[model samples]
Target: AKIKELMLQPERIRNIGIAAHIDHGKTTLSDNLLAGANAANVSMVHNYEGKDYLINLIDTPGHVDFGGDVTRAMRAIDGVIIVVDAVEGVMPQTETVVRQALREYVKPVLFINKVDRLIRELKLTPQQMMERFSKIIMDVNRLIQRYAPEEYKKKWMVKVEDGSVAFGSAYYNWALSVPFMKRTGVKFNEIIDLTLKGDNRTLRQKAPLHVVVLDMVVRHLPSPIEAQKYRIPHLWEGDISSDIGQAMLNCDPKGKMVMVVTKIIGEVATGRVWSGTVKSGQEVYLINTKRKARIQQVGIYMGPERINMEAVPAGNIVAVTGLRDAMAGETVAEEQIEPFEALHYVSEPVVTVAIEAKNVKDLPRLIEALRQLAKEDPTLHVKQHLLSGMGELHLEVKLYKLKKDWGIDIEVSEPIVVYRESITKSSPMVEGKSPNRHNRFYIVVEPMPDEIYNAIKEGIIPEGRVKNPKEVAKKLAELGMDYEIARGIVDIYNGNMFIDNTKGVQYLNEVMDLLIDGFHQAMDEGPLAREPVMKVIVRLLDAQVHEDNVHRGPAQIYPAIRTAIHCAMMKSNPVLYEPYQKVIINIPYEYMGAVSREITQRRGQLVDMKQEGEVMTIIAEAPVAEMFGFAGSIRSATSGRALWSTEHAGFKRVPNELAQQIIRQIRQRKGLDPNPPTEKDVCPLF
Candidate 1:
């Protein structure tokens, strides 16, 4: 890999990050790394996000409150240094983040912090502390295996020999892996005691945290070269041998460059933004095909500042200009080469709430300001949707941000989930004819296969693959779809939601855009009461191209295909998909029975339950709609010994009997009419 090549050289640039649980020393470690980088003169807290540097430090919070935010942070950085509490070992958020790291192709180096807490506070035996050390490694490795694919799992796995793992007391500024400490003849107990009571004046002079971590990064963690070699195959879909491909594969400084803009930190006062580093060179063309402005500015961001530099190399994190309109996740690569798109944030905002300033007088101005803010974060998906539970939380925070940052007092209503409906039955072949009588599209739709569902869970296919039944169905399994059909469908549309391009679509390639656009629209807005019909199969049977110039345009073709695809969906099985939460409860072993009772009572199933020492970690899948105020209830039941962490997992089918009742409740929550959806309310297909 070119990154590997660049890293293997003497001029290796390590794009490393310090990540940990909220209080576990992320910012602290970042401070030390900055000190090492010469950005900080003395030992002090450093916020790399605030700095404009070639080496960016993404300090992510580890608390459950910020888990979603942390996941987004991982998408922007190359690797992370995970700091763990030696005594507490693995907590809920820590496990969640470890999974995120493995999935994001983040190479991890372990750091055991708060050793002083364990040694001085717990007063455990040396052997007992050693046992705890083993547990941390085992737990992290287990997650790596759980989230990573077969090939990369072993390669990316952290090991002491590779310097990919370390143990330390960050607060006390003392760290040592078993091997390193053993070699240094430093006793773990001594280090811990010093951290707890002994002054760091002597230790700091002797062994600095940054020096230890930097040494660890260079020795054990994969250099940019090693990272790029494996990262490209996992991150990029282009050919590894082509000129553009080879350049990226080799991390060539002179190759056809590509970059994925992961972020942009704007400073209105200076009219500059500290652009996030991408996978391409510093100098590149900006093409925003989605907007009117194409080929904008071509400069770079330097340390909390923007510079008009003309060139940037691969692996170097720099800012860009000329594309002032560019947003995060937008692609800027070699003008002639293909654009590089990174993975989108997996979570979708299920609820939206209208926000008006607390004072009526400030409402209009606040709304406009929020609108501009929402435009920058398109995925924030803020609109006039319901705000209940977490949705309310998001809105409240947003309003607070407006007030605090933008000086706008705001009020928001309750939140609600954005539920969708789809056809539950197969659809007959539908004909789509243009208004001008120049184009024709024949399509059929059916429910997608269950295998596709499995593929999604397995990470083999992307999420929301249910958008196009016929197209995404092929990606459900390794066997895939018939080459011809896949190609034909793709040729007619821009792209399938979850599935890759199909060679079959090449046959009808000329008119494919119109047909596929229709196919996507059908999925986006189904005829079943205008609800999104998911998992249904769509077969684009045929299409007639216009012989005359004025016969057709996207305006005519889009609706035609959408109409045809929906007609087909009515023939397939479609149903409402309820959101499920991956529920994890950390409880004392004595309270397992009580927790289990709550689980069974809620119609939840326990996927796994294990007890170690006094703690019991329970993993279960439960519906989110059923989880309102669960934290308080679980605490009440488990005597405050039971703790829980909940994250949005995936959707599942609502139980038959409860579906109607739940639907009614949701409608009421949404402030709709009290009655459940009927012919007018429920989609005919549902």
Candidate 2:
């Protein structure tokens, strides 16, 4: 499928990100690549000197736990160069990243870094190194095959035939791979010998090494047109024949436009605003928002500044302003255009804390600081909660910025995980009574169908990807739900505050939006702590909307539905559930026993185990909280040979016996009363 039209030079437009596990040289490699792009070293690294480059490299945290940030990064780019350690080859994070790359259908190139370390430091012979290299190549290809759609899997899967792999030492600034070494008449041994005695500085200054890599990228990596063509299907869902859909498919210069806001950069001068482009020449009327957008200020992001201005063409990644509510990964189109589904990727804020100010005096500063941070990073959510910590590391880092960047001082409370409660079993009819008898609603809550629910659990169907609810409800209806009700629910809930808001009610058209809004408010605001209720499908069984406008307004119905839903939900078995992560570790075969022991010791559930030659890769799942100090523990036991990566696996119910205790433990820490639920009120005798 064709994507939007292009007016800018394709070679000048490069959308890429540098990703890897923690401490594995992602930023360093990015610095080198960026320097090569501009023919100057901008970022600080051991090999590169002071700033003098134009290429922008988003320096993302390499921790596997920060999958949300990675997801955001992936959405903003056209391609990815997945950086991995040569010796470690396909660690746990390799799966998390490769999975994302495949999901976005982003053309990927692997940089098997630290190659010299494998032969020199690890002392692997040439044959062993070759075998290890082959394994890495196979693993990458297998990921493409497994995750990518069937049609283009083989064609897109990378092998030496496509020159999809690059091997090098980012530390020493020397790179040689199958393609590079072969075409240039160099050997792996020759590269290894250089690392050992090539005078790192001389290798950096003399070798035409980086140019070869740059040439490789230009040769293999797809242009924006090539990437967005297939990428549109991965990111967009709309009627292809319609104006907006056809424009998006063809990347037409003069079509109803949509641009995915990939990143938001806040500046000191202008307040918090989005920094992305609208497809060039495609007329996009402001939707639910208006701003003083100027044609002169438009340009693609080149690090901190937007340069080469004139207009933002369809096929280019550029920065824009005036869109305040436009969030990252959302498609921006004409105000009157049909609502396209949001782009949803599997990601969550696994780490959280109940934050406050250190200097009660700096409370405002702390708030401002967090607000700015939140605008830049959407995964971070702030809530007033019951908890405390010695010092808020996340908060302190922000406050440190508040002082230096924003010019403010602040203190903060402890970091705590925001645990949510969801139901495991379906509940019967529940009545929500309005306090003033102005409005009332009956609701039934049950788990969504297993297929869709499991897809959510696995990160296959992400948040923003939800398109027409009516259509989705219809699809689910085909699987289980009665079609009429499903379709009716879909149509009724097509508003700001409802999912589906009708069941067996007559002449209620006037107050339906308000009634559905009540249902929506009830679901997300939770009856008690206001945390979101997941998994449970809430059905609006019935509602009574007063004919009088005053009687049927938000005040009359919102609280009525909210109160009733809270009562019914509280009456059932409500348990606080925490998010968990699926961890995969690749270790040497000799340490298989040690790896198993360590996982079990860390409260990790080992689900599967496999071995390939000298390595044993274990697949396991563990609660995020329980995995604290896990990295150090694994390293300590493996004698520094074990490497692991973790992906946000989703949530599970806390064991019934321990549910209350866990809640109490969390509550007490956050300074809240964690009393157990009482009879009738807790499980609902009604």
Candidate 3:
């Protein structure tokens, strides 16, 4: 295979990234690697050659909120350089990104950044510094063994002796790895003594940053050809024996042009061409939208700028313009085929605010700008009720960009807590008749098993794999899902699915679209508050389609199926689910009592706490609605001495005592009657 041949030529190419926690020097390190590229953006790809190898560098964001950028960027790269702060050791976001990389099967190398802080700030000896580095290595490898695929467990661990690890200060513009130190005879004590004597200028001239970091990448990271063999099975779900699958699995540049668009910035879509050589002006098909567009230009990123290319071969990252219908996670191929599995997220939006233009005339421009914003980052979900984000800072950053970059003044509603609704029991099969009494549908609604909910969320039973019932049943069993439910799934989307429980029904397939559309509409606004429905299994037990096409049109089937689902849902024990956020705070020991009191008052649960040196770290989980002004409250309590961060923890069922009040509040805010709607509100069953 061409990929087998390319594997032998490892020195030809590399696609790599630098990831870490916020303020961990990812951007600074990129500046050193790119030499002239901007690192302020979430990610920028730069092509460079060192020694005998070509390296394509993708620098990504490390903030807890911008983890979506890190997740999306992981899809287009072969390996990642997991950067860590030397003083902080392994922080929360550090572990978060590492787990994200391992789940994607992306190879990892380690870089202990901000080493200069140890020498200059803490005045640590060489022995103490070595201990910190060793601890970080152990922490990282532990996560790798826990989350990485079994086959890659041993191969992906970073070792200092193997030169898979490096230590340096991006600000000082110098670094050192075992290989670099051996080549230059630079001892640990020498670096310590230099910092002790305050002679930092000589460090840069002696050990250049780019030479050390990029050299480690070229030496340790696997090339795209080598990575695809193992990565393809985890990414692409298709018949491996088939021609198109084999072509992608083998990375055959001459076979099929298949690429997964991983990120979109403005009008350009950036993705790695998994197979076939792509050239300018070639028409490609978008698998998701089933639309076609001809590329007007093709190129690779050099920081914020682009270097136009005549042709970019497989195993390389390329950016293309003119894909109007293309967005992140959509597959673009020379011919129509099944898409790659959907990108899974470690976290989702928990907080939101309704946005409106300051000037009513700018409403059109504001709407257009938001469309671009959501395209750029999928985690930032844009909707009419509100623009939701992973956390407070996540929403703030988007608003900042809208005003600063898009150049529009906007007014945002008070922070809103996004909620979901689900049923707690099963409802008897109920019949729903169309408004004209021409169509009748029978359906049941019940709470889906938690195992299946998690399976769908993780994309383990993703789209396009429903055809393989045996495979789905096996995986479902492994994930603790009910085998009967697994075998009955007909469709899966956004954490919900349709089950065909009926044995055999005539003309059912013809009206499947209308039924599915109706199911989606009911899921969009449950019988309770107008929140999205989740964890509810809707089963089609029976259906009677009219012989006349006009009688069983979308108008009839849509209302019929929707009414059936709503009727079942209202019969079940329905309740609301609120989003919870995990909050981390770094404050002085003196304010521990004050902070603890404030957290408990807001109904936050203290998970864990630790004291490091004079600073104390408080870890807590709280509902997003209660944490609306948490930052300001913490600032006032600590007198602005606390540093903190929050990210989406997950969803939790609202307490039974408070669920009704919260639901009523949400209903009033949406301008609905402050009461729960029933199935009768949808339609009457005759």
Candidate 4:
């Protein structure tokens, strides 16, 4: 694999990502190897002898809140180096990262990081230390065995002997796989002693992390040639025997171009050529936007510089320019080909902040800056200046970019929990008439089956218009929807479905888009607390429209349907759902009581606890609203010795008595009357 020769050879390439849960020393390990790419940000390449392999090293987020970033990085890579803090032993976010790789069909190789901590901080005996490492490995493998695809589960179980596992301290810049140890004649005792003695120079010479990490990647991680076979089928929807399908499966450069744009920076997009050779001046079609744009420039990013290249072949990461309309998760190809599966995120918008222009003159600039930020960050749910993101940190990062990068002065409100509004049962038919009373819409709102709601959320059937709508209708029918209602499914958004149950309603097609628009508005801000709605099926039972199109205008149709949906929800026992978190805390046994007490005091409950050698692992759950300032509280409670991460555990219905109090607070903040609405209060507006 020579630098120029390797570009065209997928057999010699290994594209890997450095991924882990939050604060596991991933970027340090990444930077150590990317010293070459550090000078360069976008992409990197490595050489073992004259065999130069293109290593497109992507940095994945550690926090579960940034799981969308990890998913983006994972989709473009063939394998992942799952770094687990040795002392922490497969943290909660680590399992999430591992699951992401398995879902993307990316192979996992373990790097037990922070070995120095085991010796220096915990003061573990060598015998006891080895057991800790073993536990970490076993815990990781169980996830692999459980989640890995059937054919891959047995082979990808990452054993130490074959060099699937490595142990070292990323901070010390030293790591070694068992095979590398055998070759270098290094032993555990020497590493243990030198680490304890604080001798960095000698350790660096004996086991350079880049060498160990690169060797494991080159040796154990499957080359793109082998990885693409199983991956393409899962990513694509076309039949395997078809023309373009076979080309993609074979990784044929001669095939028409196909690419999945996983990362969008600014004007330039970072993507991997899934199949075919794409040239510098190639014109590409975007699957989502359904538009064509010329690839103005093509090159590899060499230290913040575009090192222009004539062409990039299949299975290599390439940087391209001139596709301004391209978006994250968009597929680029030569024709109207079926795009790859959508990028599903493990985290959703749970926390939100409302931002305002400090100076009124900056409002336009703020909105433009926010639009750009949301374009690149799929997890950010910002609209009309109300910024909702995966977590507080997620919001902070975007806010920083807006102020620092975009040079806009904005003031942001305290982070608020984003809630969901849904009904527990079906409501009676709610009547809504247009302003002129010439049109009427009968809206029936009901709770959809939980299984189908979750299935849509899982990206099983995408949230928009599907390609084979009939197949989706059949599937929804199997899941419990009536065939008639399922086949009439007009649109789906935010785990909610809109079905056109009306029959022989003339001029309906002209106003169908308007009615759906109304349903969207209602879903955006439901009846209770004006929070976004979910888990709902809204059917247009009947539509009575005026013979004259002038009377049934958008102004009349949009609000008529919107108000009916909202009023129906009010009568259907609407409920509010608050975000909950799955908290995993690792601390010494002595402080266990303090941590549990803190959880209990904050409306949280301890789910389980166990001793792992000298450390105690606590698993618990808490509502996000109660979790504000939890970091400061945990440190104060445990003297800053605990390591913890919180994962989104979906949402729970707010309790009846307490729910009213919370609703009152949310409504009051949003400038609404403190009490939730009754059908009579909103029906008159309809």
Q: Against the true structure, what is each candidate's TM-score?
A: 0.52, 0.53, 0.58, 0.59
> For candidate 3, lDDT tens digit of each residue in 593-658?
999988988889899998644456788988987887777798788776565677667677889999
All candidates: CA RMSD (Å): 12.4, 11.4, 11.3, 9.8
Model 3 deviation from the true structure expressed as Cα RMSD, one decimal place: 11.3
Clashing pairs in 3: none
Ranking by lDDT: 4, 3, 2, 1
Rank candidates by TM-score, best first. Answer: 4, 3, 2, 1
Prediction 1 TM-score vs. true: 0.52
**Pairwise TM-score winner, candidates 1 and 4:** 4
Model 4 Cα lDDT, one tens digit per residue, 1-686: 13456778888778777776667886777767766231113455666645767666754554444444555667777888988888777765577567767877999898989988887888778788778878888998888887677788788998777888988878888887878888889987888788888898898878888888887888778777788899888778888888788778887888898888866664777777888888888887887666688888887655345677867788777778888767767899987788785432356879989898887787775777887778867778777479987676667888888788877788888888888988998999988888889899987988988888878977776786446768888889888888878887878888898888889999888888888788889999998888989899998889888888889888999889998899888888899988888787766577898999999988899998876434567889898888887877887776655556677777777878878888988999989999877777776753
The local distance difference test score of each candidate is 0.55, 0.56, 0.76, 0.79
Error of 4 at 394 (Å): 5.7
TM-score of 4: 0.59
Which stretches in model 2 have alpha-carbon errors above 4 Å?
1-7, 37-69, 123-128, 178-187, 205-209, 266-296, 335-686
Worst 10 residues of 4 by lDDT: 35-44
CA displacement after TM-score superposition, residue 173 of candidate 3 (Å): 0.9
Looking at model 3, report the run of 10 residues with the lowest lDDT sum.
36-45
User: What does candidate 1's lDDT look like per residue over 1-686, in tens digits?
Assistant: 12222322312555656667657766667665555441211111222223211344543444443334444456545667778878777775576566566656777878877766777788776678767877888888876765665576676677755556776656666566555565566665666556567667756644556656656665555545456766666565667666766665656666555665555543111111112223322354554333322223344333333444434456555444345545554556554444445332234455556555567676565656666566545445544332322333444556667788888665656444555555555566567777776777666654545664345444555443244556544544344556544543332121123222333433355555555556667666544334344455566665566755465678877767765555445445445666666677765466788888887777688999865434467888777666556666776676654545655565666666766665666656646665543433332232
